[PDB]
Structure formats: C-alpha cells, structure tokens
Design a protein around this nucleic acid. Structure first.
Ligand code: 4QM
Ligand code: 4QM
Ligand code: ZN
Lengths: 42, 150, 183, 750, 228, 105, 55, 146
DNA sequence: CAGGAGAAGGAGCAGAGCG
DNA sequence: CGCTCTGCTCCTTCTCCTTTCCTCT
RNA sequence: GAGAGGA
C-alpha cells in the first residue's frame, strides 16, 4: 500500500481533514465527568 | 500490582443496565439510617427507573432483602424465580414493610423522611473504566515528526 | 384373507426397461398403441441404446426440406443411456401368483438429432483426460454393435416360470427388528 | 446436557473430530509423491498421529499449558507420521519421524488437562473452572471464533424488485472448488451467469446441454401444469431456436465457445464445454457418467424457483433466516490450514528430492529423510503464525480471511466464558442493511436473544444459547439407500410430466426422487431417527409451498434438544426424571429411548412446540425443556430478566464482561498483560439457575451493596451514584490492577 | 418523512422514492367527478380493457386480434373510443417495433397485421403479442397509481404516485393553480426556480414539523436560498 | 387432515391395485414394475386382508406395508431383454403401472 | 403459438414456405402441417377483474 | 383484553372463511392488519387510561410524569398495566418461519399473542414469546441508533 | 463489502439536404 | 428518391463518498 | 498495523 501524495492528501485522515481543518491542540486535557450542584453555572 | 480505592468518578453497574459514576463520597453520619442504624452503601437515584422500566431491579431488591432476612439465596431466573408474594410474606414476617420500603431518618437533620425509602441489598458490580486510567492532560511534549503536531 | 403368493425367479442374465419420454398413452380407454420399431443399436461398457422408428410419409412429412437440409431421413433416432437402479423388479401374472424378475437397468429414450451433427460435420470440413470426458471418449470411439428385434415371445416367460418353487428359499435367520436395524 | 456436552463444546468437539479424522483424511489424500525420473522411488504416508511416538503406550510429554503461558512458548504436540521409502535394491522399509508441532486446543483429547480432577490441575497451575477451547500460541491465549456463513450447496433466491430482477445463485463449495452459479432473470428471460463463462447464457440451451433436449420436458420440469407459469417461461424457450435449433452436442459446443476458463493442455471446444457442464458449472455435483439427469434436474429446479419468484414475489427465502446459515468452528478452519500447509510441504519436499536425485550417478538414497526435518520447521512456524496473527492466507481457494483468532478476554470470569461460544457475522460492515442486524424470531433457543455487542456490531456478533448443539457431517451415502428403501422412486425412473404432481424429496439440496404420501415418509424417517437407526443430527422436514421433503445431514446446523410429546401427553412420563435425579440416564439414554430429540431451525417449521406442559393441546409434537435457555451464559447474570426492558438486558450483557472480580483460582500464579481483581468478591443475593451451571457463584465479580433508592445530596442527578464513605474505608469496591512488563535479552549475531 | 426525506431534498436528487402529486379537483363534492378525472391520470393498460388477446394466422398472412369490451369502458366511464385505443397503440409503439395498420371488424375487435426473412414473421408476431397488452392506452405513462382521498370538511382530492406534474396540471377536471408534487426538481422544471425555492422550504418545514421538532423557519429559508 | 387424506388415498390405491392385479391376469404382453428395498432380506406372499388391505411378506416374518407407486403416465414404457450378445433385444412388452413397497414399523 | 409436434416435441414454428405460404412445422423433424388457416385460436383470456360504475 | 381478543379472533375467522370489507386504499390482508392494529391500540390506550386514573396520590412514577422530571404516563402504564403492541418497522412482528412467527403457535395464525402482543406488564412478567418480541423491538431500536 | 451519481463512449434512429 | 452525414437521445459501463474520536493491545 | 470494549 504505497502512500502516494494523493493518499497523503485525500481521505478522512489526510492532510486536509486530519492536519489542516482540525488539528491536535496543546494545553488540553480529557477526563471523566461528575455532577456538582454546588458549582455555579458558567 | 496497584491497589485501587473507589475514587470519585469510578463506574459502577447494577446488573440491570443502570451504569453510573460515583458522583460523591459522603461520610456515614451524613447518610439516612433506619431504626436499626443501617446506612446505605450506595444511594441510587430514583429517576433511573420510571423511564427505563427496570422492574426486575425492584423485584431483585425485594427478593434479596427477604432472602437475607430469611438467611437464604433467592433465585431470579428468566420466566420463573422466587415469586414476589413469598418474598413479601417473608418481609412482613420479620417486621418490615411488605413492599421493602423502610422509613428512614435524615442523617443531617435527624428527623423522619416524609416518604418511605426503598431500602435493600442490590448486587452492584464495579466496572474496569476507572478515572485513574482516563485522566490525561497536556501542555507541551512530544510532537509528530512529520507535521510537527502533538 | 385369501393368500396371493408371489415368487422371484432367477436373474436370466439382464433384461432392460425402455421408457419413451415423448410417446404418451392414448387419451382413450384403450392405450394399446405401439410404433413400428427396427434397427436397434446397443453399446456395452457405456450402456447406450439407439432405437429407430420409421415415419409414415403420407401424413406431415415435409419431403422437401428433409432432403434439402439433411439426407433421406425418415426415422427419428431415440438415444438413451442405461442407468443402473437396484431393487427394480418386473412382475407378470401367469397363475394366481406373481412372477418377479430383476431389471438392473432402466433407460429413458429421447430424440437424437444425428442428421444435424452429420450436416454440421460435413459443412465444417469444407494427457490423462480423466472424468466423465473419458467416458464420453469411449462413447464416441468404438460403439454401435448391431442388433435385431422380435415382437412377441414365450421362451422368456417359460424360462422364468419353470422355477416352480423348487427352491422356496424360506430360510431367514433375521427377524423384523433385525432387518429394521440392518437396512 | 451440560455435564455430557459443556458450554465450550463446539471448539472441543470440532478439534477432537479434526485430530481424529481429518489428519488421516488429508494424509490419505496426499499419500503419494512421485517423480519424473527414478520410477522406483515413492513415499507412502501409511499413518499419522499427534503426540504418539509409534506405540509409545503413553501420550508424549507436553509442556503444561501454564508453563507455556509463562514462558511465552507455544502449547503444541508433535506430529509423527509413517514413512515408506524405497531403495535401488527394491527394499521397502518403515520409519516413524516427527513432521512438525501442531498447537493443541486446551482441554481437548490431546491436552493433558483432558480428564484432570482438582489435583492434576492444581499441580499444573491450571484453574479447574477455566473454560478451555483456546490455544496458547507465543504465550498468548488465542481463540478461534465460530464463523457463521450462508449454507453451502443450497439454493438462495432473492427478488430485487428495485429493478424487477430475481436470481438463483448457489455457492457450491467442494474441498477444492467454490463458485457461484447465479440464474438471473433479464429481459423476462432466464439466464445462467458464472465466473468461468462469458455472459448470460440462455437457460434453454444449458438445459439442452444437460441432457433434457426434448424441448417439451423443459416445460414439464419448469412449469408443470400451471398456465400462469408456462406463459412466463415461454418467452425464453424460443431462444434455443431463434439463433438456430440445437441438439445436445450443439448446445455443449455453444456453451464451451464462450467459456473463459483456460486450458493448460489442448482440449477441444466441445470437450471443454462438456467439462463446463461436468464440473465447472456446479462444483457441488460432479456428473462422472454418461447421464446428466441429476444436474439437469438441479438446474430445472433452480429455474422453477426463479419462475415461482417471477409469478409472485414474497415466495423468496430470507437470507437472514437462521436455518439458511451454517457455523464453522475451529476444527474445520484448522483442517483447511493444515491441508494447505501439508500440500505446500509435500511440494517443497518433492522439489528438493528431485534436485538431490538429479545427479546422473552416485545418487545415494541414504539419509533421504534430512530435508523433511529441515522443512518440518516451516509447517509448525506457518501454523503458529497463522493462528497467532489471525490472517489465514490460503492459495488453493484464493481465500483471505482476517481476524479469525482473538486474544482471550480476561476481565471477569463471565467475560472469558462469553468470548468463547461467540459467533461473528460474515458481513464486513452492513452499513444501512437492517436485515442481518435484526433479531430474527427463528433464533429462539439457538442464539442468545439479548447478548450482542451494543454499538457498531450491534446485531452482527451473536452468542450461542445454553441448550444448543452444533452438528457435524454424519453421513451422505447411507441416507440415499435408506430413502430408496423408504419408498421413493429414483431420479432416473420418474417422467417430467408427473414430477410436479407429488412431493419430491431433496437430500441435502439435490433432488433424489419423488415419493407419494409425504406424511408417511416423514413420520417413518423421524421414527427411525428417534429409535437410533441414524444419527440424531439428520433433520427431515416438509415444505408445502414447493412440495418437498427436505433432508439435511451436513454439519454446522444449530440444534437444540426438545422433549418429544405423543398424542396429548409427553414422553418423560414422570419416572425418567426420577432416574435422572438418581444418577442414571445421563441425557444419552434419553436420546436412545426416544424421549428427547434435536431440532434444528428448519425442522421447527414442521413442529408445534409447547412452552409448558400445561399448554399441550393434542396437536403439538414437541415440548420445551425450559424457556429460560433462550439466553446465553452472560445473559444469565440478570435477575428477573423477564421484567426489565430489553435494551436494559442488552446493556447488562455488554457491561457484565467488563466487571472487575475474581478471574481464576490461579489468578495469583498468573502474569497477564492487565488483570483487574476484586479484594472481597461476594456471591449475588438473587441468583439465577444459569449462574449455578456456569459457576458464577464461585468466581463472582461484585458485592451486595445496601442500596437506598432515594434522591440524595443532588450529586446523583443523571445516572450518578452516591457512594458511602466509611464503607469504602472498610473495603467496598476495593480493587487491584496487575500489569506485566516483559524483557527479552536477545543474543545478537555478533 | 424521516432523515432520508431531508437527504433527498438536500441532495436535490433527480429521482426520489414515492413522489406524491396532490391534485385538487375543480368539482369535488361528488365522487362521480372524482373518478372520471382519476381515469384520465392513471396508467390504464390495454390489459384491463382488452378482455382477451389472440394470435390468428391465415392461408398466407397472420395477425393479432384483441376485442375491447365496451362493458368495462362504460363501467369505468373512460373517455376513449376504438380509434383512441388504435392511435394510442400506434403512438406508443415507440417501445414496440412497428405499427401502421389497424382494422375494426365489429363490436371493437382491433386487428393488427404483421407482414414482411425466415421465421421473422413468427418471432416478430410472438413478441408483438407478448408486448401488446401493456401499452398505456389512456392516461400518463409515468404514474404508478392514483387514489381519491377525502380531506376534512368534506373536500376531496386525488393523490398520484408518479412524475407527471405538468400533465396533471394540464388535464381538465383539476385546478392547475393548486397542484403540487413532493419532487423539488419537477417543480423547478415546470414552475420556475422561485417555486422550487418555495417547495424546498415548505417540504423541509413539513418534514421537521411532522417529526415534532422545533426548528425556526428562518434557517430553512436560508438553506433554500443557498440552494437556489 | 393430511393423515386422513393419506389413509383414504392408500385405501383407494389398495383397491385399485387389487383390481389391476385381477384384470391383468391375462398375459398377452403386459408387465408391471416393482420397487423393493435392497439387501434382499433372507419368498413370501402379497397377502390381501379384509376391507381391501394389501401387504407382503418374505421368508423372514416382515410385513412391508407399502403399496402404490406413482400413477405416472404419458411415458410409454416397455421392457426388453439381452441374450448373450447374440441376436437379442426381444420385446417383452409394456408395463401397466408401478408398485413400490416399503418396510413399516 | 405454444404448440409441440409429436415425435419431436419441439416448439412449433411458422415459416414462410414456398410461394410465401405460412407453414407450421418444427425444425430438426421430418414433420410439417398443411395450413388450414389455423382457425384454432391461440386465445389468451386476460384476467380482467371486477370494475365499479358511478356514471 | 379478553374482549379485544374475541373481536380480533372473530375478525381473523371472518378474513379466513369469508372476506372482510376492504378499506378503499389497501388490500384484504393489509386491511386486516390495520384493523387489528387499531383495535389493539385502542384497547391498550383504554386500559392504560384506567390504570393511570386508578393510580393513587404520591405515586413516584405519577409524580415524575406529572412534573416531567422523567418518563411519561405511557411508561408507567407499561410498567403497571400492559405493554400492548410491539411494532417493528411500522407493523407487527414479521414471519420468522413458514406462515408463523414462532413454532409455538399454529400455522397461518394472525391472532394477537401470536404476532407481537404483550398482554403482560413488566411487573407481571413477560411470557417467552412476549419476551422474544420485546427483545426484537429493543434490538431494532439499538440497531437504528447506530 | 453495499448504495448513489455523475462522465464517457457505442449505438440506433429522425432530419436535413442532395445530384 | 434512396443515400449519406450530423445530431440527438438512449443505454451501458464505468468512478467517488459512508461522525465523533478515545483508548488499549 | 488491525481486535475489541467505551461514551
Ligand atoms: C424509467 C426511469 C424513470 C426515471 C429515471 C425518470 C423517468 C421520468 C423522469 C422525470 C421526468 O422526466 C420529469 C422531470 C424532469 C425534470 O427535468 C427532472 C425531474 C423529473 C421528475 C424526471 C426525473 C427522472 O429523470 C425520471 C423520474
Ligand atoms: C396421431 C394422429 C395425427 C394427428 C391427428 C395429430 C398429430 C399431430 C397433431 C398436431 C400437432 O400436435 C400440432 C398442433 C397442436 C395443437 O394443440 C392442436 C393442432 C395441431 C396442428 C395438432 C392437430 C392433431 O392433433 C395432429 C395433426
Ligand atoms: Zn418438430
């Protein structure tokens, strides 16, 4: 499966849809969520 | 080996599809107690039932309470199992309400709860999706060699 | 209540059965019709039958195209393959009892267009080889040993009936359940 | 039933049958290797054995499964074959030499754990409650998942109304060839496509080439006497004369002219065309004789089904119907893989022998068995790699399947038991097709009607139920003789005119003959099956929409036991239960005495089944042993599952595998990649009759929490819980995570 | 009316499943008016008004004879005659091979003669006989069916399954100012682009209102404007 | 339903075949073809019972209760023979009908 | 036509014979039929169903 | 439920031995299906309304449906009284066998309790065929989401 | 492995003009 | 008056799409 | 790389 320049660009994980319109950003985390009524909205 | 404690945010199931997360861990005295001083280990919200129709879970609670009071393991099997009438008879023989709904005392105000509380043993199983393995944060670090992205 | 016996005779070598897929029984109550038959060709080691029935030219013969497209063809060729089928016995009634005889070969005869093949082969002229192909090879390598016909007979019936229960062959060690188990 | 035939019995029985029959079958298949030179030199594989050096009198010493798991080795047993090699002096001599190492399925007839009782297992660091049926390759537990597929050698007709097109394709599958013989309907005209012929051959021509050349017997084999069918089929009957009139030889020449199959040796076009009808058209039926009536009538019945679909739709058969599907276990897949590897090994060995013996002089024969031991690494390496990686690369069928083997899941006990007895759909994605992902009512008792990976495989992956036995190929030849005895005239003794006037009995998809009084024949055959004359898995049933008495004998059919009820009353008779409870009649004397019988999906069509004994009206012919066996091993965890809503049961079946708890008795002597353990597991209060049988009360995953169903503290709004401190402190939900780290101190070439 | 309907309107597909043409009658207070118009806008095959078809030879010629039963024509109150059926056959012979001569002998027994080479007459005549009882005699050859529906308050109108909007508007017995199909592209072809925009907006609003969801119509209008 | 219709048809076939056997007692050229289970269990008699019930036996006591094969017609079927590859193929005549027998329980 | 000739059973075909006379016969057979005009009708009675009248 | 079953049974026998007045749009079989579906829906609605009106004050499902916190009156009617018709793909359960849904009913049977009707509430407990039909509906929903 | 929708060549007729 | 280009219109056979990712292994 | 949770 040679990755032609066309393969590198096209596709869902290609440069346009995986690196240009939507990247991985720094200063971000991801964790489970739990409720907290005492916490005000916003 | 790593010994893990049920931290806040761990996932518990209820053997009926009532998966949930540990919302809060509260002290024993800040918990409802019955006439005998029993405090619940888990306080499941009552809103999980009316839209998911897990009547099997209510019957499981009643059968478990009646069996443990009678000192025997009750059977919940598809198309059969321990009938509700026998379990309610056992429950009323021991001095408990026929529907398994005890009358509790609020643990923070020390007065009666104005509604009888469904109270009994339910077999809860702890699932592997623990928050300790899912917390993840980044400020700076490794970047992809090709596109120089995280 | 009345006993209606039957006895099986010897093999008398092999007698075959011909089934004409085209010729039906008469629509009336008297299906006693049989076409004139002659020039029978047999083929052993491949079990081939070829039966020739001449046709009357006074009723729907089409004398022109028969010789224009083919040769002087006036008889349809019925070709057939004799398939073996055990347990098939032919029965006839001589006395109150019934006489059986093994068949061991049944053939369904269907029309064969030999003249079309001949016309095509005349018009065109101007290493295990396993499987049924090999059999087909035999079928078109050596064949067609000629044979005659005979309408009506009595010696076959006599040779089948002369058994006269001289060997009843009633000995049987097995029983109902044993035979059921050993089908 | 579970004592004599456990939950993990598909894998075990399939692998045992494989190692007992298919090894010798493949050996006798490729029993000879020849050469162009030296005609007095041949190798004859007299016999083959697994783990049995010669007589020996004892199975060879195998590494215990846990030792293989810890050392990252591969659990396997040697394969010893017999040798017959000649000599220039014409002397025949014998030898017994290893040819490779075949991996051994856990708890099979070859594994040491076979018949080990609580002491041998303890001494071998093996959990007594472990399911088995999985291989240990490279120290990893890999299980060959049961594969579901469409029934081979069976007619499946689908009416694509989207265009007005119907079809009659059959994926005839032999031990060497597998090809689809579609019978499409284009321009109101029936055709016959193929992967080996050019394009859309008319049906009348192929029927003439198959022997039925009368051109009127075609109308009596495809339409019978229905006026509404003859006009539909009259359109394509004139295509055997529109181009030109045809005879059998001419039709064979026409079909062979457009044959796309190539000839490696020169063959006549007519000769090849006959081949195209002899074997190429239908690999299932090989007509190695001078009469093609069986194949001709097979094509005629395909065309009859197509015309029936044309006259009125809704007479087609659903592909998703469970009776139309077969299950292939680990035994058959390993048979295929070993046959491919063995033929490659024989080819390589023959090439090496020819290379060594090519020398004109001093071509010594001594030590002719060196290259065999050189190549014996290749077979075992290929076998282990193909099992481990899950990519089954084959060349004889040009078949490539990926993901056959899965790593055995170790989260709970129920997870490891439910990964076993799992079925994977053949469909890749089935994006929008809501057909194979639906819950067909035909799977009642055959598949767990609640357990299914919720999500993107929600309907594709299914699991076997409790009462369920997968069939195996019993016989094919004796049943033909039994039918002929039973009173059906053969296929070469019935005229086409009367072929559709009475029921025709189809044996395993191919027409055998026509028999009057189908009910009497069915009853007598069922009585013979019940009394033990034939195998219990041979299923005979009656179809009335097309008058047929089908008999199915091939393996892979899903069967379940049911109590036979006579007129009005059952056959258990209340005294066989007493003997069963006493200790005799271990569910096998129940089959021998004809009290219970195995029904597959198709035979249930002809049956009337009672849910309980109190519902038996004097017309039903079967009784359910128990209605709670419609749920699999996982779904037996739920208490009172008949009161919940179905998605709740499905979610429980999904998330019960990922519940931490006790895993095995040797869970502390085990070094796995990731183990979750419960410090204080507790037996459930509200048990289930299923969980006693699968030993879930001995290795539970959970604790009996004193729940108070009440809105408290506000921190439990949406599915959130309120855990009680001072109970976590006393130990509640306390768990342990064990993770292994491996290190290999490789020796470099330097 | 689910997600697939929104997808069909969004993608502006040239063919949709189940296109419905609502047609309002000029006079709908009586079913007699509601059925005479219906027969004009249905694919009325010859087979329903042929009553038999035969193929008859002669000494040196052959033909196909079909006797139209006037009883069914009168009972179906169809507005067509023998000449209408003949001209319909001749004009719709586009699908067929050829047709130039039609004869009437008595009580509407139409005979079509085929005359020419070997076997051409027989094969051509057999094909013509097979393909004769399906030519659309009266109506629109783009309609699966048409059903009279009764609206509330006593009104009624005809719902048609097909793509003949222009013909349905043109045929008498209906009001052309109020007759609409589900197909957006058809409305675009027959009523300009503004009517296409109106149809897009109205159909999207109807699909998302029948499903009970509350989407503001201004977003729908913006989508229609973007599309058109 | 099916069982009653099958029994009625079997009785009709029993009486019909008894009439056929009585009628074909004349022996000009007519035959009849029987189908039997193989293996030759080892003759007997085609014993007719009261109310038109027909059954057969062999040397072993076995009552093969099966009577009446297909009533197939419009297929002219005749029987011939073969005599040692010499002048042979003597037409033994046609057959009237067919009988198939079957062991019962 | 949907007719089959005896001794051949193939489908009957109408052919333009000598002097343009339509003769009915089967190929591959020594069979013909001097045409009587074939006044025997190959009539197909189309299954028309019930109809309702309002006018 | 017995009254509804009696009406459906007489409708089935009328469709079998004789013919029923076909609706102006559908055919005979579709008319039968629509009529029995409508009758079952009506009886389920009536018994559900009876159950809801007979439910006492301070009832947790009743309060959670009145205030709208969770569920609705349909859910509590199914949990208490009955869960009538298990429609799959817009109609009753299809045929999983030859002219049948399950091998536990007579051939060519279209009466309720044989083609997807669950007269048992979740409290009472589902009969095996009712359980299978409800499982079919639930899996249909699960597959629909994905 | 299915489903949807365009672009590009054969292919079979109308239509026009004609010597 | 057939004959011979254009031109149009089918008809068939081809190509490019099918969430979110979020982990582990 | 591809096997499977997961929401
Ligand atoms: C047998 C095949 C049917 C189908 C492919 C053909 C046959 C008739 C065609 C419609 C009509 O032409 C009228 C409209 C014309 C507009 O411009 C585009 C839309 C429109 C509805 C068409 C769409 C499509 O093209 C149809 C349905
Ligand atoms: C045996 C005596 C000869 C003569 C009486 C038989 C033999 C061949 C028969 C004809 C063919 O079958 C073809 C046609 C079939 C149609 O259905 C009815 C007419 C049709 C012309 C037949 C008429 C008649 O029946 C014939 C002439
Ligand atoms: Zn002919």
């Amino acid at each position: 499966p040679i990755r032609g320049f066309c393969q590198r660009l096209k596709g869902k994980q290609g440069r346009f849809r995986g690196n240009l319109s939507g990247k991985r950003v720094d200063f971000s985390g991801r964790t489970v969520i739990s409720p907290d009524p005492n916490l005000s909205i916003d | 080996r790593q010994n893990r404690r049920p931290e806040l945010g761990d996932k518990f199931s209820s053997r009926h599809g009532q998966k949930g997360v540990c919302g809060i861990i509260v002290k024993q005295e800040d918990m409802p107690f019955n006439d005998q001083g029993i405090v619940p280990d888990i306080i499941m919200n009552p809103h999980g039932f009316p839209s998911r129709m897990t009547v099997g879970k209510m019957i499981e609670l009643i059968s478990g309470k009646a069996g443990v009071l009678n000192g025997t393991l009750e059977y919940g099997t598809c198309f059969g199992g321990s009938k509700l009438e026998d379990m309610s008879k056992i429950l009323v023989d021991q001095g408990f309400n026929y529907s398994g709904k005890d009358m509790l005392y609020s643990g923070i105000t020390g007065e009666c709860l104005q509604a009888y509380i469904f109270f009994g043993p339910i077999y809860y199983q702890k699932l592997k999706h623990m928050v300790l393995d899912k917390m993840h944060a980044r400020a700076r670090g490794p970047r992809a060699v090709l596109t120089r992205q995280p | 209540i009345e006993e209606f016996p039957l006895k099986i005779s010897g093999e008398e070598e092999s007698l075959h059965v011909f089934q004409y897929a085209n010729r039906p029984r008469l629509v009336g109550r008297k299906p006693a019709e049989h076409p004139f038959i002659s020039a029978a060709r047999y083929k052993p080691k491949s079990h081939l039958w070829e039966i020739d029935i001449p046709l009357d030219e006074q009723a729907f013969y089409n004398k022109d195209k028969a010789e224009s497209e083919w040769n002087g063809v006036n008889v349809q060729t019925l070709k057939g393959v004799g398939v073996e089928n055990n347990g098939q016995y032919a029965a006839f009634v001589k006395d109150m009892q019934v006489y059986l005889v093994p068949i061991e070969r049944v053939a369904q005869l269907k029309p064969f267009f030999k003249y079309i093949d001949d016309a095509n082969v005349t018009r065109k002229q101007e290493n295990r080889l396993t499987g049924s192909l090999l059999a087909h090879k035999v079928a078109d390598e050596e064949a067609n040993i000629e044979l005659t016909w005979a309408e009506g007979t009595f010696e076959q019936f006599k040779d089948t009936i002369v058994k006269e229960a001289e060997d009843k062959t009633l000995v049987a060690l097995e029983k109902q359940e044993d035979y059921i188990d050993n089908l | 039933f579970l004592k004599v035939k456990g939950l993990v019995k598909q894998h075990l029985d399939s692998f045992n049958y494989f190692v007992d029959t298919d090894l010798k079958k493949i050996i006798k298949a490729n029993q000879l290797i020849l050469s162009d030179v030296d005609p007095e030199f041949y190798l004859k594989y007299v016999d083959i054995r697994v783990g049995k050096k010669s007589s020996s009198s004892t199975k060879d010493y195998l590494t215990p499964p846990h030792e293989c798991r810890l050392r990252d080795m591969t659990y396997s047993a040697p394969i010893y074959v017999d040798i017959e090699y000649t000599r220039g002096r014409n002397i025949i001599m014998h030898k017994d030499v290893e040819i490779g190492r075949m991996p051994i399925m856990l708890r099979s007839n070859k594994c040491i754990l076979y018949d080990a009782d609580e002491s041998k297992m303890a001494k071998l660091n093996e959990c007594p409650l472990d399911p088995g049926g999985y291989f240990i390759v490279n120290g990893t537990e890999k299980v060959i998942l049961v594969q579901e597929q469409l029934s081979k050698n069976r007619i499946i007709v689908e009416a694509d109304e989207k265009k007005g097109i119907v079809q009659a394709s059959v994926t005839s599958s032999t031990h060497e060839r597998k090809s689809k013989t579609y019978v499409i309907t284009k321009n109101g005209k029936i055709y016959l496509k193929h992967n080996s012929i050019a394009e859309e051959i008319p049906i009348a021509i192929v029927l003439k080439a198959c022997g039925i050349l009368s051109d009127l017997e075609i109308m009596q084999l495809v339409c019978g006497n229905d006026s509404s069918y003859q006009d539909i089929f009259a359109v394509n009957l004139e295509e055997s004369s529109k181009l030109d009139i045809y005879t059998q030889q001419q039709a064979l020449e026409y079909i062979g002219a457009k044959v796309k199959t190539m000839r490696r040796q020169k063959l006549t076009i007519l000769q090849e065309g006959i081949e195209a009808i002899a074997t190429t058209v239908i690999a299932h039926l090989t007509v190695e004789a001078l009469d093609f009536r069986e194949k001709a009538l097979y094509i005629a019945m395909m065309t009859r089904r197509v015309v029936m679909a044309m006259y009125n739709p809704k007479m087609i058969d659903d592909r998703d119907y469970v009776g139309n599907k077969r299950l292939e276990l680990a035994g058959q897949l390993i048979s295929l893989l070993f046959e491919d590897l063995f033929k490659k090994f024989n080819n390589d060995f023959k090439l090496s022998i020819d290379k060594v013996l090519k020398k004109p002089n001093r071509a010594m024969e001594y030590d002719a068995l060196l290259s065999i031991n050189v190549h014996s690494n290749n077979i075992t390496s290929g076998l282990n790699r193909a099992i481990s990686t899950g990519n089954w690369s084959l060349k004889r069928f040009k078949m490539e399947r990926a993901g056959v083997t899965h790593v055995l899941s170790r989260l709970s006990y129920i997870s490891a038991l439910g990964m076993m007895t799992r079925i994977s759909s053949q469909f890749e994605k089935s994006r929008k097709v809501s057909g194979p992902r639906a819950l067909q009512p035909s799977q009642f008792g055959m598949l767990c009607t609640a357990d299914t990976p919720e999500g993107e495989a929600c309907g594709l992956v299914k699991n076997l139920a409790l009462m369920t036995h997968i069939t195996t190929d019993d016989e094919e030849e004796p049943i033909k003789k039994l039918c002929y005895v039973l009173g059906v005239e053969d296929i070469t003794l019935i005229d086409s005119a009367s072929l559709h006037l009475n029921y025709g009995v189809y044996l395993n998809g191919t027409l055998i003959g026509s028999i009057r009084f189908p009910t009497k024949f069915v009853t007598q055959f069922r009585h013979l099956r019940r009394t033990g004359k034939v195998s219990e898995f041979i299923s005979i049933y009656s179809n009335s929409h097309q008058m047929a008495v089908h008999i199915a004998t091939d393996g892979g059919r899903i069967c379940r036991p049911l109590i036979i009820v006579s007129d009005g009353q059952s056959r258990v008779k209340d005294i066989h239960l007493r003997k069963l409870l006493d200790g005799e009649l271990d569910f096998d004397d129940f089959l021998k005495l004809g009290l219970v019988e195995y029904l597959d999906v198709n035979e249930e069509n002809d049956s009337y089944i009672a849910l309980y004994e109190k519902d038996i009206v004097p017309s039903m012919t079967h009784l359910e042993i128990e209605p709670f066996t419609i749920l699999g091993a996982v779904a037996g965890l739920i208490p009172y599952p008949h009161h919940n809503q179905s998605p709740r049961n499905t979610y429980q079946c999904a998330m019960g595998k990922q519940a931490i708890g006790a895993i095995a008795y040797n869970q502390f002597k085990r070094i796995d990649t990731l183990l979750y353990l419960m410090t204080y597991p507790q037996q459930p209060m509200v048990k289930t009759k299923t969980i006693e049988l699968i030993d879930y009360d001995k290795l539970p995953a959970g604790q009996n929490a004193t729940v108070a169903v009440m809105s408290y503290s506000g921190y439990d709004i949406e599915d959130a819980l309120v855990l009680n401190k001072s109970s976590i402190d006393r130990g509640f939900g306390r768990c342990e995570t064990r993770r292994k780290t491996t290190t290999v101190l490789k020796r470099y070439a330097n | 009316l689910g997600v697939p309907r929104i997808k069909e309107i969004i993608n502006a597909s040239k063919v949709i499943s189940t296109p419905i043409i609502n047609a309002v009658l000029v006079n709908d207070n009586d079913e007699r008016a509601a059925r005479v118009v219906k027969g004009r806008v249905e694919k009325t095959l010859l087979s329903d008004v042929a009553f038999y078809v035969q193929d008859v030879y002669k000494d040196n010629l052959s033909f196909i004879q079909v006797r139209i039963d006037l009883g069914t024509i009168d009972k179906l109150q169809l507005e067509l005659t023998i000449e209408d059926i003949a001209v319909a056959i001749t004009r719709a012979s586009k699908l067929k091979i050829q047709a130039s001569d039609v004869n009437i002998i008595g009580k509407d027994r139409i005979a079509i003669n085929v005359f020419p080479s070997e076997n051409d007459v027989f094969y051509r005549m057999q094909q013509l006989r097979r393909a004769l009882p399906d030519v659309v005699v009266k109506g629109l050859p783009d309609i699966s069916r048409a059903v009279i529906n009764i609206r509330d308050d006593g009104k009624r109108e005809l719902l048609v399954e097909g793509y003949g909007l222009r013909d349905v508007m043109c045929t008498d017995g209906v009001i052309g100012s109020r007759t609409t199909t589900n197909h957006v592209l058809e409305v675009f072809s027959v009523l300009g682009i503004e009517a296409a925009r109106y149809s897009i907006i109205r159909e999207i609003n109807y699909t998302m209102s029948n499903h009970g969801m509350s989407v503001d119509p201004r977003h729908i209008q913006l989508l229609g404007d973007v599309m058109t | 339903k099916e069982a009653a219709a099958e029994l009625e048809l079997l009785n009709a076939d029993h009486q019909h075949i008894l009439r056929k056997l009585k009628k074909m007692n004349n022996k000009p050229e007519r035959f009849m073809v029987f189908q039997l289970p193989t293996r030759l269990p080892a003759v007997g008699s085609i014993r007719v019972h009261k109310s038109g019930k027909l059954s057969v036996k062999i040397g072993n006591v076995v009552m093969d209760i099966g009577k009446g094969a297909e009533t197939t017609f419009l297929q002219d079927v005749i029987a011939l023979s073969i005599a040692d590859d010499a002048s042979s193929a003597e037409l033994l005549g046609r057959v009237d009908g067919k009988i198939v027998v079957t062991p019962q329980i | 036509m949907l007719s089959f000739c005896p001794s051949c059973n193939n489908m009957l075909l109408i052919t333009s014979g000598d002097s343009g006379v339509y003769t009915l016969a089967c190929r591959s057979c020594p069979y013909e039929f001097p045409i009587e005009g074939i006044e025997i009708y190959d009539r197909k009675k189309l299954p028309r169903k019930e109809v309702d009248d309002v006018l | 439920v017995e009254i509804a079953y009696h009406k459906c049974d007489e409708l089935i026998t009328l469709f079998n031995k004789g013919e029923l007045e076909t609706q102006p749009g559908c055919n005979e079989e579709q008319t039968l299906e629509a009529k029995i579906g409508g009758l079952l829906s009506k009886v389920r609605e009536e018994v559900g309304d009876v159950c809801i009106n007979e439910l006492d004050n301070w009832n947790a499902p009743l309060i959670m449906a009145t205030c709208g916190s969770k569920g609705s009156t349909l859910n509590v009617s199914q949990m208490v009284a009955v869960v009538g018709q298990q429609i799959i793909s817009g109609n009753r359960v299809p045929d999983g066998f030859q002219d049948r849904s399950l091998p536990h009913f007579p051939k060519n049977s279209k009466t309720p309790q044989s083609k997807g009707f669950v007269r048992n509430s979740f409290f009472s407990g589902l009969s095996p065929p009712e359980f299978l039909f409800h499982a079919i509906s639930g899996r249909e929903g699960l597959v629909d989401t994905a």
